[PDB]
Tab-separated table of N, CA, C and O and ligand atoms in Angstrom:
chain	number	residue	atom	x	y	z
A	1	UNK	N	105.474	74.782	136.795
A	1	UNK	CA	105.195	76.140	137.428
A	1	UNK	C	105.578	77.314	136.526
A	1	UNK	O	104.717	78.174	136.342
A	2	UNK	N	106.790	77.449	135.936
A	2	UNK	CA	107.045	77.992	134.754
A	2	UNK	C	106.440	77.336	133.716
A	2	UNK	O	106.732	77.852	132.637
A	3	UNK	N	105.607	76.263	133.622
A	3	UNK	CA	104.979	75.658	132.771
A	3	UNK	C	103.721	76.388	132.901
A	3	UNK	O	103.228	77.046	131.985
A	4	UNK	N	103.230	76.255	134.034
A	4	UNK	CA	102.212	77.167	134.378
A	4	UNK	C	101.614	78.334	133.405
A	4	UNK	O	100.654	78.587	132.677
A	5	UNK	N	103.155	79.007	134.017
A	5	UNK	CA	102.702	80.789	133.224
A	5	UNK	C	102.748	80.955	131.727
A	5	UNK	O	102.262	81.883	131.081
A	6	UNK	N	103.657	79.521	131.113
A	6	UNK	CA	103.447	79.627	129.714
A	6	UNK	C	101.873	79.546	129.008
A	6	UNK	O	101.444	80.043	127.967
A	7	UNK	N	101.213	78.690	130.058
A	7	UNK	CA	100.345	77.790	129.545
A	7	UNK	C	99.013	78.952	129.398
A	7	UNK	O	98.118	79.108	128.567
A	8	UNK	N	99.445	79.713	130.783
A	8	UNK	CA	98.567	81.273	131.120
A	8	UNK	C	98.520	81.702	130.103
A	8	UNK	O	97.479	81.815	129.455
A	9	UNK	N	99.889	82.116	129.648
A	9	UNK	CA	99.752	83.302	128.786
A	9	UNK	C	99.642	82.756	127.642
A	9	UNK	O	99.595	83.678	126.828
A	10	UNK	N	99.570	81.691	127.079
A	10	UNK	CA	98.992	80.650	125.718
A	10	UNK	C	97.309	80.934	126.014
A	10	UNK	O	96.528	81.173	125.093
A	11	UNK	N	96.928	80.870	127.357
A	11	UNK	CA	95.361	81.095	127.186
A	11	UNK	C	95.295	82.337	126.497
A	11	UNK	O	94.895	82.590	125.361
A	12	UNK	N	95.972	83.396	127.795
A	12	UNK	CA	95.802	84.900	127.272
A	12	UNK	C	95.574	84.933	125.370
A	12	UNK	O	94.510	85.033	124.759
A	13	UNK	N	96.686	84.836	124.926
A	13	UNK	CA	97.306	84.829	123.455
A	13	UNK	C	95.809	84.280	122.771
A	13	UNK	O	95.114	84.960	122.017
A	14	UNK	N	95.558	83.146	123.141
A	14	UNK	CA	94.160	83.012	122.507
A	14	UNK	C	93.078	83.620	122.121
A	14	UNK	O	92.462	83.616	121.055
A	15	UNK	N	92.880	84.283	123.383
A	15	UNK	CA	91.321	85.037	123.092
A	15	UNK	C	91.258	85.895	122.926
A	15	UNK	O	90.192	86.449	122.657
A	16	UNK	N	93.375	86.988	123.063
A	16	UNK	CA	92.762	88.170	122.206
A	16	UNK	C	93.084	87.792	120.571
A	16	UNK	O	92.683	88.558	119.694
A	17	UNK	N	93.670	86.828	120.307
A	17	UNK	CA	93.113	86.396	118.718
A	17	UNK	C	92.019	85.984	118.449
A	17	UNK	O	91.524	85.996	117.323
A	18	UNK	N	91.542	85.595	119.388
A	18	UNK	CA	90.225	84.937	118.969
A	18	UNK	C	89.187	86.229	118.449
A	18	UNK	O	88.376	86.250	117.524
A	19	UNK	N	89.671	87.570	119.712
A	19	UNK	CA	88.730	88.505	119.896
A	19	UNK	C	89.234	89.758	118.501
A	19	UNK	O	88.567	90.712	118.101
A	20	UNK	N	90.612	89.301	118.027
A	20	UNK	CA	90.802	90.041	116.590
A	20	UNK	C	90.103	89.557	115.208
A	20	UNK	O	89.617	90.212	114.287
A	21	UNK	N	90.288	87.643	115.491
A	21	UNK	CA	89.803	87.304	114.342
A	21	UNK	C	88.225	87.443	114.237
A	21	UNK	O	87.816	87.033	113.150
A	22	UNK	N	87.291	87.888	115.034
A	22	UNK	CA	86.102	87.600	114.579
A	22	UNK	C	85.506	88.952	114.678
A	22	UNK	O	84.303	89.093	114.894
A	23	UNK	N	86.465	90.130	114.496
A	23	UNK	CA	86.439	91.508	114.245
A	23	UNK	C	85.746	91.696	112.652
A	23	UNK	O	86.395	91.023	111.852
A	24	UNK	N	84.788	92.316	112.108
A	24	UNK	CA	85.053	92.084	110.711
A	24	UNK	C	85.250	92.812	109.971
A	24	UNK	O	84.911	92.727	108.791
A	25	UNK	N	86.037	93.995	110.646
A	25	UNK	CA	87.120	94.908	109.642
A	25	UNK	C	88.356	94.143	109.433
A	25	UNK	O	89.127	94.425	108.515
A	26	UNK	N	88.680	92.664	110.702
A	26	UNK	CA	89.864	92.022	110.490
A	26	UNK	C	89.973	91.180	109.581
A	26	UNK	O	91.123	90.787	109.386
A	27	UNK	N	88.909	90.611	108.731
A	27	UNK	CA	88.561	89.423	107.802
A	27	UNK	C	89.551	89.319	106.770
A	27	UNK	O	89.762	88.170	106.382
A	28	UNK	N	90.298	90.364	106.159
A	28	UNK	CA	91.078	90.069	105.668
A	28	UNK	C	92.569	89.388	106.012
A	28	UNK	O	93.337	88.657	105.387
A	29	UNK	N	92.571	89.825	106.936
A	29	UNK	CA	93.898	88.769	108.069
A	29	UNK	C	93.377	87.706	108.619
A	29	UNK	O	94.101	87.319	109.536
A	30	UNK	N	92.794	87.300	108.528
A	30	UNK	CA	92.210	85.734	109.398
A	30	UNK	C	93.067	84.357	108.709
A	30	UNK	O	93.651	83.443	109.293
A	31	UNK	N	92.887	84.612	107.267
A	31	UNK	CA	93.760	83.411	107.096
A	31	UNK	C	94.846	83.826	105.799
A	31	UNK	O	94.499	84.874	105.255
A	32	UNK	N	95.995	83.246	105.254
A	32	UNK	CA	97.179	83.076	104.753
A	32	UNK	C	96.626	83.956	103.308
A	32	UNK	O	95.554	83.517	102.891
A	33	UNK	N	97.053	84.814	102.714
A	33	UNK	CA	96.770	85.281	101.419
A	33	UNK	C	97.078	84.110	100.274
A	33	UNK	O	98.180	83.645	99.983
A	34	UNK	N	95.965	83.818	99.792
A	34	UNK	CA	95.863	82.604	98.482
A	34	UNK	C	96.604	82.729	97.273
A	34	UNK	O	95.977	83.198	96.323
A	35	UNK	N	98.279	82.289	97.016
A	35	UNK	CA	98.516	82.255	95.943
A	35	UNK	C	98.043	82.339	94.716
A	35	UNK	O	98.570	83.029	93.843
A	36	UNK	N	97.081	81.689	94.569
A	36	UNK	CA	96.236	81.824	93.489
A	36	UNK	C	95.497	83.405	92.958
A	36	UNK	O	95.474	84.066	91.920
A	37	UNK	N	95.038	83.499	94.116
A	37	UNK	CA	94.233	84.912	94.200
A	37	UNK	C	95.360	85.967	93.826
A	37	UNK	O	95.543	86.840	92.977
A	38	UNK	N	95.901	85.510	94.728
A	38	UNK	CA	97.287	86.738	94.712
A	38	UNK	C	98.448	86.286	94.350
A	38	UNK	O	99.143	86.143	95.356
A	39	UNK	N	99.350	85.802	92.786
A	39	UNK	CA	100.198	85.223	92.745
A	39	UNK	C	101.454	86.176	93.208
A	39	UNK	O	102.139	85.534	94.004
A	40	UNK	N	101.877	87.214	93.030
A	40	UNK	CA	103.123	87.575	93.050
A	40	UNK	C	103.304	88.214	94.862
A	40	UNK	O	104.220	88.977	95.167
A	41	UNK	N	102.119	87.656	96.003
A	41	UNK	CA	102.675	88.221	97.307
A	41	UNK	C	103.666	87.712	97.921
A	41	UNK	O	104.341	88.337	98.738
A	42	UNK	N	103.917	86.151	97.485
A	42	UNK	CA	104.724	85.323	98.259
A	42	UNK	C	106.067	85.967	97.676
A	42	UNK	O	107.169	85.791	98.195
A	43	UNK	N	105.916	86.469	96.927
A	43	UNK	CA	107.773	87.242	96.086
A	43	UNK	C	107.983	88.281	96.832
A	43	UNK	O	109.118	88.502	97.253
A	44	UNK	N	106.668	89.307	97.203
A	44	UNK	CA	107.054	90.501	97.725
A	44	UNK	C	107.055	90.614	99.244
A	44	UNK	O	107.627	91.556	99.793
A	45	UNK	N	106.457	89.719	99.890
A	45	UNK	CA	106.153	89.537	101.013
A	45	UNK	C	107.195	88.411	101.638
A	45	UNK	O	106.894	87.249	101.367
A	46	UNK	N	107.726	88.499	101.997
A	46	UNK	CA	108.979	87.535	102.966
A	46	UNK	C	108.693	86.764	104.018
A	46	UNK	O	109.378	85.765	104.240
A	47	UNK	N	107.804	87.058	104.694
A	47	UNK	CA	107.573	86.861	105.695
A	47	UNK	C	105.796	86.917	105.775
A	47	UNK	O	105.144	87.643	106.526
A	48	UNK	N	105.304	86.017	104.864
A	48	UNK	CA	103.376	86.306	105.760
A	48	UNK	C	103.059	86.147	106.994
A	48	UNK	O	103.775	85.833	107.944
A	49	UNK	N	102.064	86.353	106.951
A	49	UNK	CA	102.075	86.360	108.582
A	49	UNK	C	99.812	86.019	108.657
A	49	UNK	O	99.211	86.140	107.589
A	50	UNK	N	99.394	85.831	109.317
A	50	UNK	CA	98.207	86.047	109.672
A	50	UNK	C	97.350	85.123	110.637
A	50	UNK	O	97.600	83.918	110.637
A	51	UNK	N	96.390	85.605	111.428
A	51	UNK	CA	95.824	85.413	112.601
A	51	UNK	C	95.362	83.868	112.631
A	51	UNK	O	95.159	83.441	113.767
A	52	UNK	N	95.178	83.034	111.662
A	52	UNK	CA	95.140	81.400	111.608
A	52	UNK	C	96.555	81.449	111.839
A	52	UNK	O	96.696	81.000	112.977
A	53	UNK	N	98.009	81.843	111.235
A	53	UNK	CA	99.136	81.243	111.529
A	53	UNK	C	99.471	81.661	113.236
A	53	UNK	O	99.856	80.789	114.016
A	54	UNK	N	99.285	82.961	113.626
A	54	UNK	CA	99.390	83.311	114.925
A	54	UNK	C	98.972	82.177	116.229
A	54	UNK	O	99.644	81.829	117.200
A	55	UNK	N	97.292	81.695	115.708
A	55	UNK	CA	96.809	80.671	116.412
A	55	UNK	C	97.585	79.160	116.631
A	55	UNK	O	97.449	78.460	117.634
A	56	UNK	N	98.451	78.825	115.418
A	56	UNK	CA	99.153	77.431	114.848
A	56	UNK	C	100.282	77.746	115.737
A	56	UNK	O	100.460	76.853	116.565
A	57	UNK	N	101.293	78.966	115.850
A	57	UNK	CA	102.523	79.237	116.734
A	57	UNK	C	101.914	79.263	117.929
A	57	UNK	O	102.597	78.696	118.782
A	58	UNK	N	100.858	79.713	118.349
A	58	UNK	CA	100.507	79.824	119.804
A	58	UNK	C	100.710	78.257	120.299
A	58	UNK	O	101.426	77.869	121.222
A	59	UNK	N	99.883	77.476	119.429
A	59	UNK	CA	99.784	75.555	119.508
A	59	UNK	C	100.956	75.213	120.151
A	59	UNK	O	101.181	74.572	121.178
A	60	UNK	N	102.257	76.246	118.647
A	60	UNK	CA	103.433	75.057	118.861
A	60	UNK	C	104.455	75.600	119.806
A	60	UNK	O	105.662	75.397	119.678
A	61	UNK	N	103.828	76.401	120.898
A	61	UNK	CA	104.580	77.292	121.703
A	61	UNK	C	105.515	78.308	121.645
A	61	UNK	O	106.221	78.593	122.613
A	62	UNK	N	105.576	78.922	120.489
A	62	UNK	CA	106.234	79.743	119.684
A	62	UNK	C	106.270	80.940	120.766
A	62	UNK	O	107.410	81.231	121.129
A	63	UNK	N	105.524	81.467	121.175
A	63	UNK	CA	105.284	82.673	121.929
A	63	UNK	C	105.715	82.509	123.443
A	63	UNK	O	104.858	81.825	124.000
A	64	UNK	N	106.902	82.946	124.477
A	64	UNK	CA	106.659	82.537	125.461
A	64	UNK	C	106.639	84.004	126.319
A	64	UNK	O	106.847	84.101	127.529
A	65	UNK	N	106.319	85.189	125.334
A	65	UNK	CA	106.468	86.390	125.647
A	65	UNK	C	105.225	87.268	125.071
A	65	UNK	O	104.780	86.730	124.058
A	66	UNK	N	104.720	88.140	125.325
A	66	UNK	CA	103.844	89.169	124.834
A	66	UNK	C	104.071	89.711	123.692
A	66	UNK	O	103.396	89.908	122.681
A	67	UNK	N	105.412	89.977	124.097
A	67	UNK	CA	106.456	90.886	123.318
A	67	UNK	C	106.779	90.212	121.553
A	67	UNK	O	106.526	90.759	120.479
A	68	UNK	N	107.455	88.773	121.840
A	68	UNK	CA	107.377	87.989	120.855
A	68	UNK	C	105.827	88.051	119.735
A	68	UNK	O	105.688	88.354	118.550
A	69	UNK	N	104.986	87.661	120.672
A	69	UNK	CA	103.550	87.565	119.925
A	69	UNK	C	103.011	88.701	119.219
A	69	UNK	O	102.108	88.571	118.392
A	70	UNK	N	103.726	90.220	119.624
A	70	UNK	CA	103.216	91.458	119.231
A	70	UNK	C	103.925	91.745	117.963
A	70	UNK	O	103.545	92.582	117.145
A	71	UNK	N	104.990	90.993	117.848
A	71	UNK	CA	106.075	91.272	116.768
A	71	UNK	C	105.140	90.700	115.388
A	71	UNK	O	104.819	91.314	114.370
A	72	UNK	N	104.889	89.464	115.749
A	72	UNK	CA	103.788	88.734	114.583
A	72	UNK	C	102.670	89.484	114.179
A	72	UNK	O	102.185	89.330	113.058
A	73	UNK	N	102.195	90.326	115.040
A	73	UNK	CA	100.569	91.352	115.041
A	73	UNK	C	101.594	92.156	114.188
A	73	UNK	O	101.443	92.153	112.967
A	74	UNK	N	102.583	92.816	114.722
A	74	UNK	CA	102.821	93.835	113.769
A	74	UNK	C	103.187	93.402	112.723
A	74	UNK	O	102.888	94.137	111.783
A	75	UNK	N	103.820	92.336	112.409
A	75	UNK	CA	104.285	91.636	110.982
A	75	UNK	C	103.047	91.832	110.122
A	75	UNK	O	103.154	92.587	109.155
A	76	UNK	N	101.668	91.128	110.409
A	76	UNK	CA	100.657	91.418	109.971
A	76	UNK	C	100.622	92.262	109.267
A	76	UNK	O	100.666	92.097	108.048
A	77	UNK	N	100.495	93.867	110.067
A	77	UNK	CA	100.261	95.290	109.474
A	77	UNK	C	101.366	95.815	108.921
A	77	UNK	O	100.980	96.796	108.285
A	78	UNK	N	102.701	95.683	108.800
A	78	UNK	CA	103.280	95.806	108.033
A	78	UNK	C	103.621	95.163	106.986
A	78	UNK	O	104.103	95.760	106.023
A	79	UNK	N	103.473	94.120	106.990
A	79	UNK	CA	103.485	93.217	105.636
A	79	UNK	C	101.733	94.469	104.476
A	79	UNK	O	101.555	94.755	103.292
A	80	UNK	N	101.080	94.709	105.581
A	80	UNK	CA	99.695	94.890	104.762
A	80	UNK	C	99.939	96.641	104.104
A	80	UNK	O	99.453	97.200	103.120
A	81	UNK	N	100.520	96.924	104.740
A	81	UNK	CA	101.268	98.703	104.786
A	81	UNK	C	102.189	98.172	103.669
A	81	UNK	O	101.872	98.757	102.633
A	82	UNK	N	103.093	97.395	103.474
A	82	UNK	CA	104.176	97.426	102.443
A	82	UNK	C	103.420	97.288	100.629
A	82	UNK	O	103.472	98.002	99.627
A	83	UNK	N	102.440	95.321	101.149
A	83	UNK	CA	102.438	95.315	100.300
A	83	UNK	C	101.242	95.932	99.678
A	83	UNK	O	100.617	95.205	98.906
A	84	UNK	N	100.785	97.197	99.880
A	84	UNK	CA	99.526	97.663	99.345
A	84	UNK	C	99.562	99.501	99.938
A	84	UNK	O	98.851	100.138	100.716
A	85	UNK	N	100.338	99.723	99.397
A	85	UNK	CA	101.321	100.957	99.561
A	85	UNK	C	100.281	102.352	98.722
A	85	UNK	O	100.565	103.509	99.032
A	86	UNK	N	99.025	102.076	97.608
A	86	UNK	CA	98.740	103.359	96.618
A	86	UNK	C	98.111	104.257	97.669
A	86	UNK	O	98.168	104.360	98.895
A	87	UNK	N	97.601	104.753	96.852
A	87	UNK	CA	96.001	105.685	97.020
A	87	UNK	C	95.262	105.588	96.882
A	87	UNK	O	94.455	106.420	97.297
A	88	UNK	N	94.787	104.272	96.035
A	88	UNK	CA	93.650	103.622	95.570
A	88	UNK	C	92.880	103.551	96.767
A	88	UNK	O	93.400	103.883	97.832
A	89	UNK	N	91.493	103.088	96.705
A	89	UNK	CA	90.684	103.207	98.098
A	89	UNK	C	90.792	101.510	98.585
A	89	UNK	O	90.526	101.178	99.740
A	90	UNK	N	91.114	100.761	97.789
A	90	UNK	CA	91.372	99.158	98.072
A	90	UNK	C	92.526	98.870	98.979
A	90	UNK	O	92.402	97.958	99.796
A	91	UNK	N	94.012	99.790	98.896
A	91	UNK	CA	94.441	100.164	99.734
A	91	UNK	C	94.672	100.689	100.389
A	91	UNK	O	95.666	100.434	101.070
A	92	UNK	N	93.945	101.703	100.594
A	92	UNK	CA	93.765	102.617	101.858
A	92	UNK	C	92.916	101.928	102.366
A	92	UNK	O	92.913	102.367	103.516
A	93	UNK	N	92.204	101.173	102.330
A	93	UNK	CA	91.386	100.686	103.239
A	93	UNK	C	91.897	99.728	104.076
A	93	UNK	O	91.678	99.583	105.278
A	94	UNK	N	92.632	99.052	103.308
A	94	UNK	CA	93.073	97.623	104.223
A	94	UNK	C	94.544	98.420	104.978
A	94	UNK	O	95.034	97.717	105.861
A	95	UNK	N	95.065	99.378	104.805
A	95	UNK	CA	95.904	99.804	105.505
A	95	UNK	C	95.299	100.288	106.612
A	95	UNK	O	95.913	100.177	107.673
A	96	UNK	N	93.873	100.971	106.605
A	96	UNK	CA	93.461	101.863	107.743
A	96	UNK	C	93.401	100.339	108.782
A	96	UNK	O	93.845	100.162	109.916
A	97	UNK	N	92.762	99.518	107.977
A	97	UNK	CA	92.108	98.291	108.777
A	97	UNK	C	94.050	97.738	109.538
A	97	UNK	O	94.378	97.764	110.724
A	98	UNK	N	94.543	97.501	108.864
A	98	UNK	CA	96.417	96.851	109.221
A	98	UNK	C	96.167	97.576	110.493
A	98	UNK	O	96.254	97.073	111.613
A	99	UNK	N	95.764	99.128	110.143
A	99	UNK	CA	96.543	99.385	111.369
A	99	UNK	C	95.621	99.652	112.526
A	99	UNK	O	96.227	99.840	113.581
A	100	UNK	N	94.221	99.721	112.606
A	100	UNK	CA	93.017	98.906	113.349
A	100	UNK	C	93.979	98.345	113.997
A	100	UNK	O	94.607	98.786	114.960
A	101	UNK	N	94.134	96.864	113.174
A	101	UNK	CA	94.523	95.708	114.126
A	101	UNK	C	95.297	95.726	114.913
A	101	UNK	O	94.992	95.437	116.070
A	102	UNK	N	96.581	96.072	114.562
A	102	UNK	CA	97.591	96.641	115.144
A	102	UNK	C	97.414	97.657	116.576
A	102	UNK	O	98.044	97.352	117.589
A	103	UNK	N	96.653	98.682	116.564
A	103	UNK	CA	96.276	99.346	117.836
A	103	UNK	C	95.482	98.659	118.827
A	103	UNK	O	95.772	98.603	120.022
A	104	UNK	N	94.373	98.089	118.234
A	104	UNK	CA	93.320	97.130	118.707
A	104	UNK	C	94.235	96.057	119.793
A	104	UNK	O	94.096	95.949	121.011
A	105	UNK	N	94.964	95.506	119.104
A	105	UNK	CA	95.747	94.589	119.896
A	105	UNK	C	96.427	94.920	120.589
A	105	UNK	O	96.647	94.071	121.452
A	106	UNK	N	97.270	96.347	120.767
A	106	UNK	CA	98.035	96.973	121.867
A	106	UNK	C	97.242	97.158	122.835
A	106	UNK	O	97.421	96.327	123.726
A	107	UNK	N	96.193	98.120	123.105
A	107	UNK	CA	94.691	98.603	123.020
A	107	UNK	C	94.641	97.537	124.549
A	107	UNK	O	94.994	97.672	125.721
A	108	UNK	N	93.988	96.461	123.716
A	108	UNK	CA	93.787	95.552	124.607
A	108	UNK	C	95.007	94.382	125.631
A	108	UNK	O	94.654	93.853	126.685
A	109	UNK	N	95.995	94.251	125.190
A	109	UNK	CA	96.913	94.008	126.045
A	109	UNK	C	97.224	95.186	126.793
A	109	UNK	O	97.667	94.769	127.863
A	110	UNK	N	97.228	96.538	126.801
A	110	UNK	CA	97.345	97.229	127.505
A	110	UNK	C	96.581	97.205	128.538
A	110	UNK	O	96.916	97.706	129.612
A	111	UNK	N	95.729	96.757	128.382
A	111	UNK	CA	94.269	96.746	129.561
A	111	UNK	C	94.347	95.895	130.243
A	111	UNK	O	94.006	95.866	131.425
A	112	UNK	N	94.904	94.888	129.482
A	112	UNK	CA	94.321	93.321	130.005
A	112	UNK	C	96.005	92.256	130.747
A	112	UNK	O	96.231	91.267	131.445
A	113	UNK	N	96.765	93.333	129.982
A	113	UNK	CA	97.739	92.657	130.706
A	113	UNK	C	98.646	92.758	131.937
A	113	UNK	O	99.231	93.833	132.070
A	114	UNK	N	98.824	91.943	132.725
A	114	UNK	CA	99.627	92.534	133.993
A	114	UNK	C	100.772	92.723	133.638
A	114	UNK	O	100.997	92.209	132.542
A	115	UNK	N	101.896	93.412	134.229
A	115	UNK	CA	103.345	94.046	133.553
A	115	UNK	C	104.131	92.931	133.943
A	115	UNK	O	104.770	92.156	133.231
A	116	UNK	N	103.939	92.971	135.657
A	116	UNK	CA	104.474	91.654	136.146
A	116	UNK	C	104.126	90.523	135.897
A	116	UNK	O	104.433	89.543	136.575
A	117	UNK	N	103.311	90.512	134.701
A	117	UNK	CA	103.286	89.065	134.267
A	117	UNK	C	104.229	88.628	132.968
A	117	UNK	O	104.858	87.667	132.524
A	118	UNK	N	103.962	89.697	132.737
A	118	UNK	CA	105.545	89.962	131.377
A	118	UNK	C	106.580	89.470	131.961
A	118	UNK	O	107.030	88.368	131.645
A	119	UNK	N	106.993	90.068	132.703
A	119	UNK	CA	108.050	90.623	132.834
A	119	UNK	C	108.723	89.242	133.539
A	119	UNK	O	109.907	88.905	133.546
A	120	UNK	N	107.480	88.523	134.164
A	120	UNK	CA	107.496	86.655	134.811
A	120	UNK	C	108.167	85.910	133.051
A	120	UNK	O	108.969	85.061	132.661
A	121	UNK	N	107.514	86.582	132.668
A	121	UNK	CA	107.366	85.567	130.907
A	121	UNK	C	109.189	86.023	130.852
A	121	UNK	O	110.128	85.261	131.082
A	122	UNK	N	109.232	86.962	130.610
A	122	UNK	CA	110.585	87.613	130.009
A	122	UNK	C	111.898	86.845	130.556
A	122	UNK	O	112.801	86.240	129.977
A	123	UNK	N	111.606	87.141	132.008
A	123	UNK	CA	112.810	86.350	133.054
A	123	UNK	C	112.801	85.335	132.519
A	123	UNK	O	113.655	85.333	131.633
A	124	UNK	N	111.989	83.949	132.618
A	124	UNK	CA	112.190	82.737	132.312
A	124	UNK	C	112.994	82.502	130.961
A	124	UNK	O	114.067	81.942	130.736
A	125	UNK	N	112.155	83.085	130.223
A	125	UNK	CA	112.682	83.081	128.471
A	125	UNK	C	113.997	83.022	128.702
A	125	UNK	O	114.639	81.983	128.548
A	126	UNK	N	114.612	84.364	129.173
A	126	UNK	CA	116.250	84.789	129.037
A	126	UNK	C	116.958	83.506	130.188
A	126	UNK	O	118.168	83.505	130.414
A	127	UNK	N	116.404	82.900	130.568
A	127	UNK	CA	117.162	82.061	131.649
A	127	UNK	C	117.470	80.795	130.815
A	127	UNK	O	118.529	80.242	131.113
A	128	UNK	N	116.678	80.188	129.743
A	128	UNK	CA	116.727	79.001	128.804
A	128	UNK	C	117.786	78.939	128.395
A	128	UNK	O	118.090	78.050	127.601
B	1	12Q	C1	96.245	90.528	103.314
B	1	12Q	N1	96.008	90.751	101.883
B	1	12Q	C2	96.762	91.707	101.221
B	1	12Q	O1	97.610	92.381	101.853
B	1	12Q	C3	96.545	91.898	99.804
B	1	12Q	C4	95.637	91.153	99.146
B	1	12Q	C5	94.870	90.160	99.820
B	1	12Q	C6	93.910	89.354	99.148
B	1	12Q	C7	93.198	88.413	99.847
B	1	12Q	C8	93.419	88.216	101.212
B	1	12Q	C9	94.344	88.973	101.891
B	1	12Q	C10	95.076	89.962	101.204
């Protein structure tokens, strides 16, 4: 029954990733930045983050909160804000886009989510 509402809000969690990743100003967050491509992010970046790994924590029940899951969205856009900081238009672009995502996803949990359903998520969490 508390299994229940996890399982709810594991649906929820889904489809508004589903409904970020197939955005295609979001394409650059969809999956893990390629060492190769990009050798020195894994040095500057601590923490990657992106919308295939979001989907893999949702799997392994990582999220049993809104709140939790929003922290990862924002990890996203700030990891993308840090590591791509100029004036160049390559990063200004993917920053405008970071932070797209970032609103986009408030945006729509704002709409879509009930408070008291949080707030169901929240109680349980702190009771573990
Ligand atoms: C997220 N991100 C960055 O923040 C910077 C470079 C880059 C290259 C390919 C894919 C994703 C990338």
């Amino acid at each position: 029954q508390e299994e229940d509402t996890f399982r709810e809000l594991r649906i929820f969690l889904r489809n508004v990733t589903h409904r970020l990743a197939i955005d295609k100003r979001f394409r650059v967050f969809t999956k893990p930045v390629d060492p190769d491509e990009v050798p020195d992010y894994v040095t500057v970046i601590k923490q990657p983050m992106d919308l295939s790994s979001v989907i893999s924590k949702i799997d392994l029940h990582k999220y049993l909160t809104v709140k939790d899951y929003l922290r990862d969205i924002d990890l996203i856009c700030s990891n993308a804000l840090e590591y791509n900081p100029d004036r160049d238009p390559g990063d200004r672009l993917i920053r405008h886009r970071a932070c797209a995502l970032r609103d986009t996803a408030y945006a729509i949990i704002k709409e879509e989510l009930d408070e008291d359903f949080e707030q169901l998520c929240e109680e349980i969490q702190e009771s573990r």
